[PDB]
Amino acid sequence: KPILAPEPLVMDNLDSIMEQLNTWNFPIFDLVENIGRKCGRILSQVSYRLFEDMGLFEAFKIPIREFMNYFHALEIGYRDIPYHNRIHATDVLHAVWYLTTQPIPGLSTVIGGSYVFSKTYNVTDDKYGCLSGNIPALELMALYVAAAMHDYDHPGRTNAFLVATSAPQAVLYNDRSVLENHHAAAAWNLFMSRPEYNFLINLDHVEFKHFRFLVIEAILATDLKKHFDFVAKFNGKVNDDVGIDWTNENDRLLVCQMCIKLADINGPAKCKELHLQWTDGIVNEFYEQGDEEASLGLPISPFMDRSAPQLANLQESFISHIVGPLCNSYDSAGLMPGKWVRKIYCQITQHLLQNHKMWKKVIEEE
Amino acid sequence: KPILAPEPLVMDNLDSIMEQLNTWNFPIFDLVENIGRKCGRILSQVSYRLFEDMGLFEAFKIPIREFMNYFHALEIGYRDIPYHNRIHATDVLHAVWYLTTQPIPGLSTVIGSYVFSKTYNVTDDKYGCLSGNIPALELMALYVAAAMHDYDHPGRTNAFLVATSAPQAVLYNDRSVLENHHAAAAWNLFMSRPEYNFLINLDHVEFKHFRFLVIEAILATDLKKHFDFVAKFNGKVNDDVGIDWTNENDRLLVCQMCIKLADINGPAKCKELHLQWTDGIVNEFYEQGDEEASLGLPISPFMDRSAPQLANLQESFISHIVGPLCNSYDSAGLMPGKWVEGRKIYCQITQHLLQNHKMWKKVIEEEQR
Ligand SMILES: Nc1ncnc2c1ncn2[C@@H]1O[C@H](COP(=O)(O)O)[C@@H](O)[C@H]1O
Ligand SMILES: Nc1ncnc2c1ncn2[C@@H]1O[C@H](COP(=O)(O)O)[C@@H](O)[C@H]1O
Ligand SMILES: [Ca+2]
Ligand SMILES: [Mg+2]
Ligand SMILES: [Mg+2]
Ligand SMILES: [Mn+2]
Ligand SMILES: [Mn+2]
Incomplete structure (x- = not known):
């Protein structure tokens, strides 16, 4: 039997929380409480709002019922586990949307056709652009869909645990990106299992194949075993003779991968x-x-x-080894959202710096 | 339910064909006839002989019963299809053994664990062999990989699976769909029963590294990665150290080139x-x-x-795939061969490839006149 989207498709009572999606520190836990903790509707409700904000339903003639059917089925298959749940998926989706739609100081943009823009994009200053002006709508949509899917049916164990215990999934995927291959494969299988889920029906065959490829590439980029390779590759492309070339499909893919990577580990770059x-x-x-x-x-x-918890050491080393270099790379490409204040104020890197200092201080006392 | 090795584990009346395993043009189709078509025993019988030729049973205290149990279950799961069958697996295994055991002109033995074929004389000074440079554990992984490398092949290409959204393509996210399946299904089979555990005397560290090598070798057989492997290998050959036999990553790359060549050996055999x-x-x-x-x-x-274009297929396969792979492997100085008495080397493998290329070219000329 298909899992179908519940009650009236769009919930009416969430308007005041949903208007604050245009903020980095979106109060996602307040939204959870508003909906109900295990209600299983947060991902589909946020997805609807963000797709509507971008005009993606019109851009790809997406039927809303099938879209909500799929995103509800998807959210139901995120398990009731403490972190890799539908709330985390929603958070990552919100973060990739913010990073791709929000004003970026001194970024040059194609428009200001095959591109879409957020209704929340209010700056008319030529000294601000956004990624959605540089990355075609099809590729942006793939990134958003990837974020929604990227931890589907997570078991609450790491790849190393699955591999060390010869879990059936580790054997199935030959010890290579076990969780990420599973997330993508199980979410795509879900998608193709029912016509009630086919919200991509109006892509042609060529578009659909390319969409699928982009989604998979984005989801597989979330494996941290590949982190240093992505970062080195990105830094290499930024510091070459021309830099990021927005007309080159491989450059755009790499930007999207950095985006979803940053979105996935955004936590240390949020408010305390x-x-x-x-x-x-x-x-x-x-x-x-x-x-x-x-x-x-x-x-x-x-x-x-x-x-024998070592919470502070975990967070400090995660920031110094993983998140810090990733933010620095992204910031050096000039892709970080921010405001002119001759100087730039960047909320995201400010938060990361504050959170890093906080954990350091904890470590000193211990 | 366990599929067990049948009757006397070693069939006894095949020593005349089996003695010819030391020949590159092994008459594999005559062995098929000798055993019986769809007897389902060719892979396990040849595997036994080659493992014994190398002394791998003693080297890893491998129990023969479990070894034969596993290789029989494996061969039974190769389908009765025209190419990707147990006969092809056997052929690839023979080819990797030949490439790794046979004299290679001017190959030096690594300075400073290792196994040698009974067909290899230690008195070879202007000759070496790969088994003198690649530790036994890694060699055994390569052999086992060759036996496993097309397990449960459906008789369709990756591109077909991908284009039709086959369940396997969806499962493996369109990436090395068949090759992932071969490795995963063969490993799953292995782990499913204690009757198959011929690796029982590897420690845990050894076993994990063995499994990693097997998977890397099998995954290297995806031709979508062909030019990457060849470029990487050519890069390693033409840098400051060349192949460094003390470096584990160099050795892995050599094994991958070996199984790649073994897999597409056909055009480099006799007509x-x-x-x-x-x-x-x-x-x-x-x-x-x-x-x-x-x-x-x-x-x-x-x-x-x-509307077949057989000749064009074989000509372009040789010129674009097998030819550059052989040239790369040959440039590393890894091709088996003989010194010409009276500076030059005679290489049977590349000679065959050249003859077969000329044959198909001639066919192409007739067709279009
Ligand atoms: N705050 C954090 N502290 C430590 N590890 C983290 C933190 N946030 C994310 N990670 C790790 O980053 C990866 C995120 O991958 P995933 O959430 O499974 O898509 C996993 O390896 C997480 O354990
Ligand atoms: N004689 C041949 N002519 C054309 N293609 C070949 C030939 N031999 C092998 N191949 C190709 O090589 C690929 C890799 O070999 P395998 O892993 O055994 O399938 C096959 O999928 C075939 O497409
Ligand atoms: Ca430069
Ligand atoms: Mg993940
Ligand atoms: Mg194959
Ligand atoms: Mn995640
Ligand atoms: Mn093969």
């Missing part, structure tokens, strides 16, 4: 209150894994032992 | 073997072409039985 809640989630998953490791007679992985 | 293999592959292509038509898709190049 959001960052801390998300952090609680991730470590609760780690601890569940640690318990399973112990019961299997394996050594408990670093930072996964609930009876 | 008799080449043409039989060719018949097999084009029969698979034509079955696919029929399915394409019935699905309303465009028939892929060279897959339309009612």
